[PDB]
Amino acid sequence: MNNLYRDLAPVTEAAWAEIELEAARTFKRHIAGRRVVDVSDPGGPVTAAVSTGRLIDVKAPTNGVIAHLRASKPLVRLRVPFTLSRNEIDDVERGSKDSDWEPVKEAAKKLAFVEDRTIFEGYSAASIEGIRSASSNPALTLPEDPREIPDVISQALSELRLAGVDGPYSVLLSADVYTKVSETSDHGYPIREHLNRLVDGDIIWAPAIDGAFVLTTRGGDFDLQLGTDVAIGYASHDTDTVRLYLQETLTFLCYTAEASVALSH
Amino acid sequence: MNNLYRDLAPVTEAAWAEIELEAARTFKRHIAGRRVVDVSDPGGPVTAAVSTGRLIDVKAPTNGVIAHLRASKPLVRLRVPFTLSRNEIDDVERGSKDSDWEPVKEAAKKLAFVEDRTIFEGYSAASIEGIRSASSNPALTLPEDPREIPDVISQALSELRLAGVDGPYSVLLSADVYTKVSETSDHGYPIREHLNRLVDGDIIWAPAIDGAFVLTTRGGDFDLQLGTDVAIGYASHDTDTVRLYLQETLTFLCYTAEASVALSH
Amino acid sequence: MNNLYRDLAPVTEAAWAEIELEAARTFKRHIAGRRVVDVSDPGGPVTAAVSTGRLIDVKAPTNGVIAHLRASKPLVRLRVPFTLSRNEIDDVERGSKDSDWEPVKEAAKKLAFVEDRTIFEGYSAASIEGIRSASSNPALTLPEDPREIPDVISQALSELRLAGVDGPYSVLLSADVYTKVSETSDHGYPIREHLNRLVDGDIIWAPAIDGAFVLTTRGGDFDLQLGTDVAIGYASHDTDTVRLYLQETLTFLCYTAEASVALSH
């Protein structure tokens, strides 16, 4: 067995298939970051750091010796525990199709939110700079009126053009901004369609982020490094409940500072 | 023979084909529910209940015995009798093509209305909770002005987005609401087209329901269980008329409470 | 895995084989009901109810609609927990052949007693009418003197003959009555042999029932429906003991009211 200790969990095979399906579905729906960044293959469990290729000056060991430390970025392992009713698990073999997988959905939504907020806003404790912090283009303010959203977005499209950047540009919106441009309409279309006319990429719902992000998806600018992708593991169990977790280990690198514009309220 | 006792009816083969065609046509046109819910294969005549996979605590038979009743949902058999003129039946072999099949059409419309109102509004006596009652998302009020319909509908699309739900969303309208958004026009399109722009599913005419329903058609959320599909059976006959019936047996299950928004006036 | 969670139990393979053998043996010895009634194949875990084929009038949904609920009988799941010493379990691999399987035997005897008392005396909470309650033939009183038992039994054989019934008749006795007709002797035979001369079926020891039952075993009159047959499942464990259970899910149907005579004290 492995670190998931999956065979020790009192979960049947059919219940496991339903839990895997629910977690994978809810996660994909709430991920916006993997649609725009380069996603590496999983390094594996032993992978601990990503080389940046830079060098750090250290106090010379002896006379005439020049020493340099190799710089690297550590992976962070992110774990979201959740708790399942054993009655709901037992219902699945009897043929129930409405078993309560709400904790699985909440854990997948929380893991997806962490991953997206780590990619776009950073996680300083894990030495990850967000796309918002690593952007060299000027930051823009989103207006109160949703009918004035496409104007400011177009100004962001000016800045990537002034930065000398090609590629399909894509706009990612926070859930508040996505709702505002979805529910306001002008001439038989919502403002989301007006945003769709400005770019050759995609208007992407990004419920974890704040504000908005416009960026190129030409490739090679944004890199998500995975040691291991999302997995479900077993912690402990009692007569009534099974404690499990969702787990993934990653770091994020931004190679190109001028490939994005961040917007705030 | 079977319970339809079809060979006992004084109905010719050509008249039977015309009656089957008329009933099937009028039924499909008036069904909205089967276009959005999962429809099972017919279980057969012996099928009487659907297992929910839950358990009900009962008074222990003896000391040290723990007993539980299996929960289930009963099927309901729905029968709509109708009466045909025997002269109209006899006209068909002579080559008439305008035989009065109005009772067949009224029976098919009434059966379709019952089935749709059972799916969406429930039938408490048959222990069926409607989609409106089983929805956990908040209910919305439809405005008087049809030009303000697409706004409220978009708010419903917000709620399924706040519920964490994917899939093609579909809007079902009552006949009053469908007529109102069909006959009012803005900038060369009726408001029905404005509703069509908001979703990737379908604006569906639902003449049996009240208000409106917005819901996902991703699958696995709404399940119509059929023991036997719609069939035409023979009751009795006299010199002038043949009494027949339309009959179907079903139950409806909603597995996912947050997959729909109900709207009312 | 399944709902038994059998691989989670700290029970070795040899100990499992001994427990299965002990439970199966003790159960068969104490079952009288399956020897006389028709026993269906196991429906499976999803099976929840048995269709009776009857209809229940319900308040018409709308005008001109006639509705009927399908009648059914729910299965009941019967669980008898028991507790095993882990030292006795560990003794089996070392080669012990006298490991204390008394709790297994007591659980099998209790499960068998419940099943037989459910078949013959009913379980109202599970909507099961016993053979004694569903019999339309008159009830008889068993006499105090065991030498007068065969007389009354013969009167019961008159009643099935007056009911117009064929087939091998079988007599089932309570443990008190079986002991009384076993230990009293007349002319070199016990009274049990005198009972054996009256029927072409079998004198059957039935320790769970009260009184006596005479009935035909021609087939098709008494039906035991099993969703799942007797199985051993794992609940929980500590350093000293393993909690397990015996479990079976069933209902009982009596189709023929005049196929039996019940006797009481």
Swiss-Prot record, chains A, B, C:
Keywords: Cell membrane, Encapsulin nanocompartment, Membrane, Secreted, Virulence. Disruption phenotype: A single enc deletion survives less well after 3 days in 2.5 mM H2O2, pH 4.5 (mimics growth in the phagolysosome). A double dyp-enc deletion mutant cannot produce encapsulin nanocompartments, cells are highly sensitive to H2O2 at pH 4.5, mutants exhibit significant dysregulation of redox homeostasis, survive less well in C57BL/6 mouse-derived bone marrow cells and are more sensitive to pyrazinamide treatment in infected BALB/C mice. One of its GO terms (cellular component) is extracellular region. Gene3D superfamilies: 3.30.2400.30, hypothetical protein PF0899 domain. Pfam families: Linocin_M18. The initiator methionine is partially removed. When isolated from culture filtrate isoelectric focusing gives 3 bands, none of which are glycosylated. It is found in: Encapsulin nanocompartment; Secreted; Cell membrane. It comes from the Bacteria. It is a peripheral membrane protein. Transmembrane segments: none annotated. Stimulates a strong IFN-gamma response in memory immune C57BL/6J mouse spleen T cells, recognized by monoclonal antibody HYB 71-2. Shell component of a type 1 encapsulin nanocompartment in situ; its cargo protects against oxidative stress at low pH. In situ and in E.coli assembles into proteinaceous shells about 22 nm in diameter with 2.5 nm thick walls. Cargo proteins are targeted to the interior via their C-terminal extensions; empty intact shells can be isolated in E.coli in the absence of cargo protein. There are at least 4 possible cargo proteins, DyP (encoded in the same locus), FolB, BfrB and Rv1762c; DyP and Rv1762c have been identified in vivo. Belongs to the encapsulin family. Family 1 subfamily. NCBIfam families: encap_f1. Multimeric. The encapsulin nanocompartment is formed by 60 subunits. Monomers form pentamers which assemble to form shells. There are 12 pores where the pentamers meet as well as 3-fold axis channels and dimer channels; none are larger than 3-4 Angstroms in diameter. The N-terminus of the protein is inside the shell, the C-terminus is outside. This is Type 1 encapsulin shell protein. It comes from Mycobacterium tuberculosis (strain ATCC 25618 / H37Rv). The lineage of its organism: Bacteria, Bacillati, Actinomycetota, Actinomycetes, Mycobacteriales.
